[PDB]
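Box S1 | Example of a co-folding query
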Amino acid sequence: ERRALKIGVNGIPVTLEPINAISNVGPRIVNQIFDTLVVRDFFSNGAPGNGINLMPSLAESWERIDDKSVRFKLRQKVMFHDGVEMTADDVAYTFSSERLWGPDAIKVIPLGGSYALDFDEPVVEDKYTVVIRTKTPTPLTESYMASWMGRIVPKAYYKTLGTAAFGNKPVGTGPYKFVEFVANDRVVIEANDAYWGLKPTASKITYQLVAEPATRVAGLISGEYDIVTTLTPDDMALINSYPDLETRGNIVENFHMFTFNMNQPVFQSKPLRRALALAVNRPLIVQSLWMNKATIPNGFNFPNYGKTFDPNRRAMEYNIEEAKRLVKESGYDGTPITYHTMGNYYANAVPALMMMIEMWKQIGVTVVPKVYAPGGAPKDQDSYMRNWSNGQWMTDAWATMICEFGPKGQVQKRWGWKAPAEFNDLCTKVSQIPDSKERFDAFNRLRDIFEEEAPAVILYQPFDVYAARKDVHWRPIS
Ligand SMILES: CC(C)[C@H](O)[C@@H](O)C(=O)NP(=O)(O)O[C@@H]1C[C@H](O)[C@H](n2cnc3c(NP(=O)(O)O[C@@H]4[C@@H](O)[C@H](O)[C@@H](CO)O[C@@H]4O)ncnc32)O1
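Box S1 (continued) | Returned holo structure for UKU
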């Protein structure tokens, strides 16, 4: 039959506008509402779910014409949820200066510019043919279209409503259509049997916020939820002891971190940031809370970067001697510094924070936990330390070092990181040269500067665990 799925989740996105929903909790919903032109084959080249060969989706075919331009031939008679046919005009709009990457687009998609390629205006050749262009050369256009930046929006409806209102009543081409959105509580979507692709296999999907992981585990056990997300390896034995239930876990291409508001005088310079960084004992946190399943990367450096992955890079440094030394140099009065966390939105956010509070006490710093509820985030002026994550969404080190931490990103712009000039010039350089020894060495230079400056501190890649009924064979949680 087709069941109504009930999914207990760690969090609900602030919006369903597909770019502004980019987070750990938005994509699992917006990937059902919207489609992309092309998709990654997660099992290509023997890959165990992290493959990269690109396959047709809204685009039936595509041809790279030159180093700046890619022609996409679109499927025909694809319907948006309101009965409007998708055409090249919609795809052009999705990647337009008006909506995405122009100067005024930043007021409503604040991060569109930092996460955009160096686009020029798309060209519509006919109803079903669109050419995506870049002002400067880049080989990333095609894989970018398979990413969370590539979800196709309906031009007329979206432009009429505007970005914010569209985010509360989204219309897409995907296999599920919008029914309801209750901020900080739930999203309901229903089967779209007019979908161009395979017929939806669930009648409806409800994403219900269940803040505490033990409540999600109990809800799965009692049948209140069919699927639950964001568990840890410690929950696996209990769940797997029920023959009707199971867990699935794997290392994700995402890192957990803590970061700083660098507009605050206490974090305006590198010494205290680097001190907090060098006192984090990662193997201890991983052994205590992750059953040694979370992995510690050798810097801001991940295997999915391909040609810009360094398999021989050194480990990130643990040095409480230098940390004590840097605390004293900064003239640290001894005042408590807040660390904001939205409960366990990140798996093990609170138990990891309590272990780091003890580690920072052992080097002279007093950090206090400020645990808040969804929607109760502090104003920037009230934020000092906070936890975050970054999903490594491209097969190139451009994401997320340059997206997030580069001169156009939110870490320098919104959160006040005054990066060294060499860092910003290297960011500009790597974004205009092809893969080579020079490009490889330049990213290693950027990684070195990142660790010297500590605008953020990388903890580990979590071992992401979800769980479900065995008789629920399709799980829309990524
Ligand atoms: C316009 C405003 C109403 C806005 O929509 C609303 O979201 C808001 O008020 N945000 P803000 O004032 O910043 O309030 C908090 C303070 C902090 O900036 C917080 N925050 C930012 N990112 C996340 C967030 N990020 P995430 O880790 O789930 O997602 C990251 C993404 O943040 C990241 O872009 C991507 C690629 O690196 O990797 C991950 O998907 N998770 C929980 N809170 C977040 O939101």
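DSSP finds 16 helices and 18 strands in the chain. Residues 437-453 form the longest helix (17 residues).
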